[PDB]
Amino acid sequence: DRAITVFSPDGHLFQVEYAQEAVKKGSTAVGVRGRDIVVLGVEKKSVAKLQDERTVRKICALDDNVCMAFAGLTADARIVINRARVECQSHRLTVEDPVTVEYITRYIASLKQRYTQSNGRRPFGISALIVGFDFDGTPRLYQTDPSGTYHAWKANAIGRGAKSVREFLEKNYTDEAIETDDLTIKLVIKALLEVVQSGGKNIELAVMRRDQSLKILNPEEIEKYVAEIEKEKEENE
């Protein structure tokens, strides 16, 4: 019938709905709060022997205290990061205080809403999600639907297999299991590990320790944390 940016006879916005269903094509993305550290992972499983793994860039920083991850179209996501990064540098230029996570998420949501508006612009079929420590200590996580909206979540769980991983997170999202940085990281694992095989090195985790720079976990330490998760799984017969 009609699949353009106009209201349908039953309501809704079918082009926006199609964009919102396009995130399913992509990859899983999990991340949590904890007042000590925000950690988010992607778990990409596609690397040929001839492609360099440096330029996958599934997680990227904005202002060394804000980082975002992919779920959906990669080119649209990269354009979003470029524009958002420009806007964070602008909001660092004016208003000399560093950017807040809510402000940049609001800007990203506003850009997505603007692109959904009018028939000319394709509605940016990317679902972004942003973590990071604010200026006033508190680390926060917001998840932005492609249409126009952002929501502050304790767990994001966006991408392929989003429903199952979100159910697992909300099932056992224990703050006592959050506590320490290591506990937080090991809670993100065994939750993202649940998605697909996750066997050798598929997990691609990211770390933001309060005021430290964006930490990308080394593969050997990732395997160490996987072994610790296995040890916790053991002795539970």
Partner 1 sequence: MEYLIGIQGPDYVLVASDRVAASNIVQMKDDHDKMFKMSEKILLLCVGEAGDTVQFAEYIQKNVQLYKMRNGYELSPTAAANFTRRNLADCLRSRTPYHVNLLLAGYDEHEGPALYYMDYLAALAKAPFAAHGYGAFLTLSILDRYYTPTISRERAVELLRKCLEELQKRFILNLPTFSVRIIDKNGIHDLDNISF
Partner 2 sequence: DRGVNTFSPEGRLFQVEYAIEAIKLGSTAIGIQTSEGVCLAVEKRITSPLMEPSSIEKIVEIDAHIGCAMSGLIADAKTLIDKARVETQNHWFTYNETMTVESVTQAVSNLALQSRPFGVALLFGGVDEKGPQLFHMDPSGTFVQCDARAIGSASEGAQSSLQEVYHKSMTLKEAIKSSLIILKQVMEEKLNATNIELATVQPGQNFHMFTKEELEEVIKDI
Partner 3 sequence: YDSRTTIFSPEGRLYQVEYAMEAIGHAGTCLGILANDGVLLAAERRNIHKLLDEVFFSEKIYKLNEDMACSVAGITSDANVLTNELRLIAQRYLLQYQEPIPCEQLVTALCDIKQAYTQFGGKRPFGVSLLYIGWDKHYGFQLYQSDPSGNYGGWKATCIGNNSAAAVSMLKQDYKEGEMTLKSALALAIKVLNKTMDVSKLSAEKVEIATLTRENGKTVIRVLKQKEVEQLIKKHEEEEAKAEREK
* Contacting residues for 229 by C-beta, under 8 A, at least 6 apart: 186, 189, 190, 193
Q: How far is 189 from 179, CA to CA, in rounded Å? A: 15
With binding defined as CB under 8 A, does residue 114 bind partner 3? Answer: no
Measured CA to CA in angstroms, residue 236 lies from 91, 144, 160, 208, 209 at distances of 51, 38, 30, 31, 31
Residue 6 C-beta-side C-alpha neighbours within 13 Å: 6
With binding defined as CB under 8 A, does residue 21 bind partner 3? Answer: yes
Least distance CB 106 / partner 1 (angstroms): 19
Q: How far is 29 from 171, CA to CA, in rounded Å? A: 17
- Whichever of 116 and 202 has its CB closer to partner 2, that residue is 116
With binding defined as CB under 8 A, does residue 215 bind partner 1? Answer: no
Residue 24 binds which one of partner 1, partner 2, partner 3, none, with CB within 5 to 8 A depending on kind? Answer: partner 3
Residue 163 binds which one of partner 1, partner 2, partner 3, none, with CB within 5 to 8 A depending on kind? Answer: none
Binding mask 30-69 for partner 3 (x = CB under 8 A): ------------------xxxxx-xx--------------
Q: What DSSP state is assigned to residue 50?
A: T
- Which one-letter amino acid corresponds to residue 197? Q
Number of other CB atoms surrounding residue 144 within 10 Å = 27
Q: How far is 101 from 143, CA to CA, in rounded Å? A: 11
Binding mask 6-45 for partner 1 (x = CB under 8 A): ----------------------------------------
Q: How far is 25 from 72, CA to CA, in rounded Å? A: 6
Measured CA to CA in angstroms, residue 17 lies from 2, 164, 186 at distances of 13, 21, 35
Residue 68 binds which one of partner 1, partner 2, partner 3, none, with CB within 5 to 8 A depending on kind? Answer: none
User: In sequence order, what are the beta bridge partners of 1?
Assistant: none
The interface with partner 1 within residues 70-99 (CB under 8 A) comprises 82, 85-86, 88-90, 92-93
With binding defined as CB under 8 A, does residue 12 bind partner 2? Answer: yes
Residue 49 binds which one of partner 1, partner 3, partner 2, none, with CB within 5 to 8 A depending on kind? Answer: partner 3
With binding defined as CB under 8 A, does residue 35 bind partner 2? Answer: no
Tell me which residues touch partner 1 (CB under 8 A).
Answer: 61-64, 82, 85-86, 88-90, 92-93
Tell me which residues touch partner 3 (CB under 8 A).
Answer: 3-4, 15, 18-22, 24-25, 48-52, 54-55, 73-76, 78-79, 82, 115, 119-125
